């Protein structure tokens, strides 16, 4: 119907929102995984530089791996949220014709619903760091700073990290707190009186647990890690030959990737995700579902 028209504007709103939130994601990762402070400790050459390098090994890989997961999560979660609320706004708009109808999603409901995003940027992020840090530790912990990896050996290390992460809890758990949680930690100022918000959060949870969401997120994640690998390729060059670098040389390269992964200047990375046709098709199914009676 007249939906595709409302759907098209709603998509760019979602894009504005991602770009708008990346500084916040980046800043949180960089404060919680502050490698630049460890490199500053090494610049004023200290005694325990070995100890600091083994730290930086973990932090650099954790930061970049979390950067990729959380950025892909931000994109797909916002596509869900914005298309759920958009669909409700559409129906509220269609119900102004009718009489004895009240609006379901007024501005204060929209805003409380959308604030659920704070979990991903907040405690979910922190728990993701914890889980990924544990994986990097397992995979790279006992690997000498002297060990060489080609670009593709590095790719393989990243896959071993991913397999450890994607098989204690489902990924849905970092985007949304568990239902057995006080309502208050799930949206800003959320209480049992916020019936409509609670209902939107239920339907969001349905979406996040559905297999179609699993598919879209997996596709986004594969792309993200591919693109991360592509951004690093030039540093495994010298002129068309590729080299295996020792791990200590790979650390600074991995470390710098957050600036591309979480780039509001839509790095080719984020715009990459925002233009994936798979993501766009998923969004349209979400919107068709929530905008029909």
């Amino acid at each position: 119907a007249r939906r595709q028209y409302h759907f098209e504007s709603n998509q760019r709103t979602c894009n504005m929102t991602v770009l708008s939130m990346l500084p916040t994601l980046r800043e949180a990762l960089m404060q919680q995984l502050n490698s630049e402070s460890l490199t500053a400790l090494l610049k004023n050459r200290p005694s325990n530089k070995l100890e600091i390098w083994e730290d930086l090994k973990i932090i650099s890989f954790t930061r970049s791996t979390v950067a990729v997961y959380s950025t892909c999560m931000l994109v797909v979660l916002l596509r869900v949220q914005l298309n759920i609320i958009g669909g409700y706004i559409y129906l509220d708009n269609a119900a102004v014709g009718k009489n004895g109808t009240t609006i379901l999603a007024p501005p204060d409901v929209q805003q409380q619903y959308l604030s659920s995003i704070q979990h991903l940027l907040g405690d979910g992020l922190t728990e993701l760091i914890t889980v990924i840090k544990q994986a990097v530790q397992k995979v790279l912990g006992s690997v000498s700073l002297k060990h060489s990896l080609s670009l593709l050996d590095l790719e393989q290390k990243l896959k071993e990290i991913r397999n450890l992460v994607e098989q204690k809890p489902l990924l849905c758990h970092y985007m949304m707190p568990d239902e057995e949680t006080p309502l208050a930690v799930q949206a800003c100022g959320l209480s049992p009186r916020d019936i409509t918000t609670i209902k939107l959060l239920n339907e969001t949870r349905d979406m996040l647990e559905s297999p179609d969401f699993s598919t879209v997120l997996n596709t986004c994640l594969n792309r993200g890690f591919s693109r991360l690998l592509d951004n690093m390729a030039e540093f495994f060059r010298p002129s068309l030959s590729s080299v295996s670098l020792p791990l200590a040389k790979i650390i600074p390269i991995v470390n710098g990737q957050i600036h591309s992964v979480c780039s509001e200047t839509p790095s080719h990375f984020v715009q990459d995700l925002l233009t994936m046709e798979q993501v766009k098709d998923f969004a349209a199914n979400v919107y068709e579902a929530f905008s029909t009676p």
């Binding site: 040389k249 600074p252 710098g256």
Partner: peptide, 26 residues
Amino acid sequence: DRELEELLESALDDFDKAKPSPAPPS
């Protein structure tokens, strides 16, 4: 051991070399 030392001091220079670019039409 001592190959280590020159590797760690060399790697340190690579943090600045790894960051992204700036742009002219802004």
